[PDB]
Amino acid sequence: HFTPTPVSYTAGFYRIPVLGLTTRMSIYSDKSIHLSFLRTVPPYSHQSSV
Amino acid sequence: YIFSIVTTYFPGYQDFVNKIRSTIENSFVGWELEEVLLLDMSLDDGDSK
């Protein structure tokens, strides 16, 4: 839950992209704190919605 | 006694509008807001919009 956080905000310090691969935590889904974050695997929200 | 608000994203802005809407209603004095607008400044070439 802590490993992918720094590559998010440190990159966003200049607003440069970071692409995630298999992150499961839903905290990064917010568009404000991590505006420059992307995800490749679906989050838990949609597997709940199914 | 009349005003209108407009803002873009990011400053957790939902709390601002929620608080102002909650506070405006209760008091006896009749504030009458009109045409609240939400604007997206991230749109590319959205100047015409």
UniProtKB/Swiss-Prot annotation, chain A:
Post-translational modification: NMDA is probably regulated by C-terminal phosphorylation of an isoform of NR1 by PKC. Its phosphorylated state is influenced by the formation of the NMDAR-PPP2CB complex and the NMDAR channel activity.
Tissue spec: Detected throughout the brain, in brain cortex, cerebellum, thalamus and olfactory bulb.
Compartment(s): Cell membrane; Postsynaptic cell membrane; Synaptic cell membrane; Postsynaptic density membrane
UniProt remark on domains: A hydrophobic region that gives rise to the prediction of a transmembrane span does not cross the membrane, but is part of a discontinuously helical region that dips into the membrane and is probably part of the pore and of the selectivity filter. The extracellular N-terminal domain (ATD) is a site of allosteric regulation to modulate overall receptor function.
Family from the record: Belongs to the glutamate-gated ion channel (TC 1.A.10.1) family. NR1/GRIN1 subfamily.
Described purpose of this protein according to its UniProt entry: Component of N-methyl-D-aspartate (NMDA) receptors (NMDARs) that function as heterotetrameric, ligand-gated cation channels with high calcium permeability and voltage-dependent block by Mg(2+). NMDARs participate in synaptic plasticity for learning and memory formation by contributing to the long-term potentiation (LTP). Channel activation requires binding of the neurotransmitter L-glutamate to the GluN2 subunit, glycine or D-serine binding to the GluN1 subunit, plus membrane depolarization to eliminate channel inhibition by Mg(2+).
Subunit structure: Heterotetramer; the NMDAR subunits are modular and harbor tiered domains that function in concert to regulate opening and closing of the cation-selective ion channel pore. Forms heterotetrameric channels composed of two GluN1/zeta subunits (GRIN1), and two identical GluN2/epsilon subunits (GRIN2A, GRIN2B, GRIN2C or GRIN2D) or GluN3 subunits (GRIN3A or GRIN3B) (in vitro). Can also form heterotetrameric channels that contain at least two GluN1 subunits and at least two different GluN2 subunits (or a combination of one GluN2 and one GluN3 subunits) (in vitro).
Name of the protein in its database record: Glutamate receptor ionotropic, NMDA 1
Organism this protein belongs to: Rattus norvegicus (Rat)
Lineage of origin: Eukaryota, Metazoa, Chordata, Craniata, Vertebrata
Gene assigned in the entry: Grin1
Full protein: residues contained: 101 to 150 of 938
Swiss-Prot record, chain B:
Subcellular compartments: Cell membrane; Postsynaptic cell membrane; Late endosome; Lysosome
Tissue: Expressed in the hippocampus including the dentate gyrus (at protein level). Detected in adult olfactory bulb, brain cortex, hippocampus, striatum, thalamus, superior colliculus, with much lower levels in inferior colliculus, midbrain and cerebellum.
Coiled coil: none
PTM characteristics: Phosphorylated on tyrosine residues.
Description of its domains: The extracellular N-terminal domain (ATD/NTD) endows NMDARs with a unique capacity for allosteric modulation, harboring several binding sites for small molecule ligands that act as subunit-specific allosteric modulators of ion channel activity.
Family in the record: Belongs to the glutamate-gated ion channel (TC 1.A.10.1) family. NR2B/GRIN2B subfamily.
Binding partners and assembly: Heterotetramer. Forms heterotetrameric channels composed of two GluN1/zeta subunits (GRIN1), and two identical GluN2/epsilon subunits (GRIN2A, GRIN2B, GRIN2C or GRIN2D) or GluN3 subunits (GRIN3A or GRIN3B) (in vitro). Can also form heterotetrameric channels that contain at least two GluN1 subunits and at least two different GluN2 subunits (or a combination of one GluN2 and one GluN3 subunits) (in vitro). In vivo, the subunit composition may depend on the expression levels of the different subunits. Found in a complex with GRIN1, GRIN3A and PPP2CB. Found in a complex with GRIN1 and GRIN3B.
Biological function: Component of N-methyl-D-aspartate (NMDA) receptors (NMDARs) that function as heterotetrameric, ligand-gated cation channels with high calcium permeability and voltage-dependent block by Mg(2+). Participates in synaptic plasticity for learning and memory formation by contributing to the long-term depression (LTD) of hippocampus membrane currents. Channel activation requires binding of the neurotransmitter L-glutamate to the GluN2 subunit, glycine or D-serine binding to the GluN1 subunit, plus membrane depolarization to eliminate channel inhibition by Mg(2+).
Name of the protein described by the UniProt record: Glutamate receptor ionotropic, NMDA 2B
The organism of origin for this protein: Rattus norvegicus
